[PDB]
From Swiss-Prot, chain A:
It comes from Homo sapiens. There is a cross-link at residues 17-20 (Isoglutamyl cysteine thioester (Cys-Gln)). Interacts with CFH. Interacts with CR2. Changing residue 168 to K: In AHUS5; leads to impaired binding to the regulator CD46/MCP and resistance to cleavage by factor I. This is Complement C3d fragment. Changing residue 170 to A: No effect on binding of C3d to CR2. Impaired binding of C3d to CR2. Changing residue 39 to A: Impaired binding of C3d to CR2. Changing residue 160 to A: Impaired binding of C3d to CR2. Changing residue 122 to N: In AHUS5; leads to impaired binding to the regulator CD46/MCP and resistance to cleavage by factor I. Disulfide bonds join 108-165. Changing residue 170 to R: Impaired binding of C3d to CR2. Changing residue 117 to A: No effect on binding of C3d to CR2. Changing residue 128 to A: No effect on binding of C3d to CR2.
Swiss-Prot record, chain B:
Changing residue 84 to A: No effect on affinity for C3. Disulfide bonds join 4-46, 32-63, 72-113, 99-127. This is Complement receptor type 2. Belongs to the receptors of complement activation (RCA) family. The chain holds residues 20 to 149 of 1033 of the full protein. It is linked to Systemic lupus erythematosus 9: A chronic, relapsing, inflammatory, and often febrile multisystemic disorder of connective tissue, characterized principally by involvement of the skin, joints, kidneys and serosal membranes. It is of unknown etiology, but is thought to represent a failure of the regulatory mechanisms of the autoimmune system. The disease is marked by a wide range of system dysfunctions, an elevated erythrocyte sedimentation rate, and the formation of LE cells in the blood or bone marrow. Mature B-lymphocytes, T-lymphocytes, pharyngeal epithelial cells, astrocytes and follicular dendritic cells of the spleen. Serves as a receptor for various ligands including complement component CD3d, HNRNPU OR IFNA1. When C3d is bound to antigens, attaches to C3d on B-cell surface and thereby facilitates the recognition and uptake of antigens by B-cells. This interaction enhances B-cell activation and subsequent immune responses. Forms a complex with several partners on the surface of B-cells including CD19, FCRL5 and CD81, to form the B-cell coreceptor complex that plays a crucial role in B-cell activation and signaling. Interacts (via Sushi domain 1 and 2) with C3. Interacts with CD19. Part of a complex composed of CD19, CR2/CD21, CD81 and IFITM1/CD225 in the membrane of mature B-cells. Interacts (via Sushi domain 1 and 2) with FCER2 (via the C-terminus). Interacts with CD23. Interacts with FCRL5. Interacts with CR1. Interacts with INFNA1. (Microbial infection) Interacts with Epstein-Barr virus gp350 protein.
Amino acid sequence: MLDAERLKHLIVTPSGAGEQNMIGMTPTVIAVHYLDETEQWEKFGLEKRQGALELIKKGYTQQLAFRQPSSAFAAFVKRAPSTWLTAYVVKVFSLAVNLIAIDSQVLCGAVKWLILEKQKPDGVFQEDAPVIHQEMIGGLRNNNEKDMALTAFVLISLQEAKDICEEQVNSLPGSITKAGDFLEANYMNLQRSYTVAIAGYALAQMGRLKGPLLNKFLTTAKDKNRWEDPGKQLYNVEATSYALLALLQLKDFDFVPPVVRWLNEQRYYGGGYGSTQATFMVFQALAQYQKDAP
Amino acid sequence: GISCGSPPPILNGRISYYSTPIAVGTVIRYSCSGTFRLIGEKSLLCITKDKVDGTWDKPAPKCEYFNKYSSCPEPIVPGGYKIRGSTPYRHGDSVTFACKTNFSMNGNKSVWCQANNMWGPTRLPTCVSV
């Protein structure tokens, strides 16, 4: 269990463009979440909490200033809206709503945007304006298998937001389907552990990771405990966190602990250049694990 | 603008931190404390049916203390199939349903394994012909 004392530096005043605001918003949001879940608030000063909620809220508001008339986000208003960033924002808010109330029109508009504008007939989500801060997108930064990876990223957001936006966005169940579709077809062909992981969780949430697919996923793990590639410690942490989440979704608790172990054993506590995805995923994953710890 | 009352409290849980007035279209989630399980839909939003006073769209979930020995039977809806939902059903787990072509759904689409090995908090949903 990553110790609250070693995390102080994740409560961060969120400043900047539609990206840096999210960069600074990410760690705070996920940290409060961790402490909430792992109960560690008394250890680390109850009164610091109200403090960070306002901080989060601040992030949230500030972000809204970058929302376009389409209900999608780019770094600034002048810029072409970003498929990834929009997806990322939804992802974060969906988690944030556990802590702060949100405006569901903001979020549901964002989703309806991704669906009707950026999903292909075949079911992939297409990126038209790559995010300036390429480092924040985690493992998607790698070119290879990009359709599949970006499609997984969006899906994971749309599922994470599914339960809020279902009545408002009438195309949403269709989209989830059409994406998961696509992921099934190309899943057997994946090369990167990274992609196997993200897409895995994407399809795990969908009860679609089974038979030879579940097999591909599990056997991709190096040492039955981590999803790695010659890239970076961070990709791998990210990749693994997804994988952990995926395992939780299948409920193969019999295979989980050596994974958690590894994640725990990384001496990594969020924060830094490129850290956004690795931070958000690893504490999301780990907390889910606590909730579900039998 | 149009605005909701307070959300149901949840015993042994938490609610997102908002601040009044609550505007229409506001989500809040509910979670349960470390060793309690959430039973029932977790998100609630403020909506307007009459287009004059806002009201919350579903009941609050409630926390049940986690029973480690709890398990429910495989739940079946005549006329629908289970979409999301992975067996074995231990305490707190959920399942969602869709009706088959030529069936309308009448009821809440998801159920939770209650500590008493029955599915709640509603009745299982009903699918009906056309």
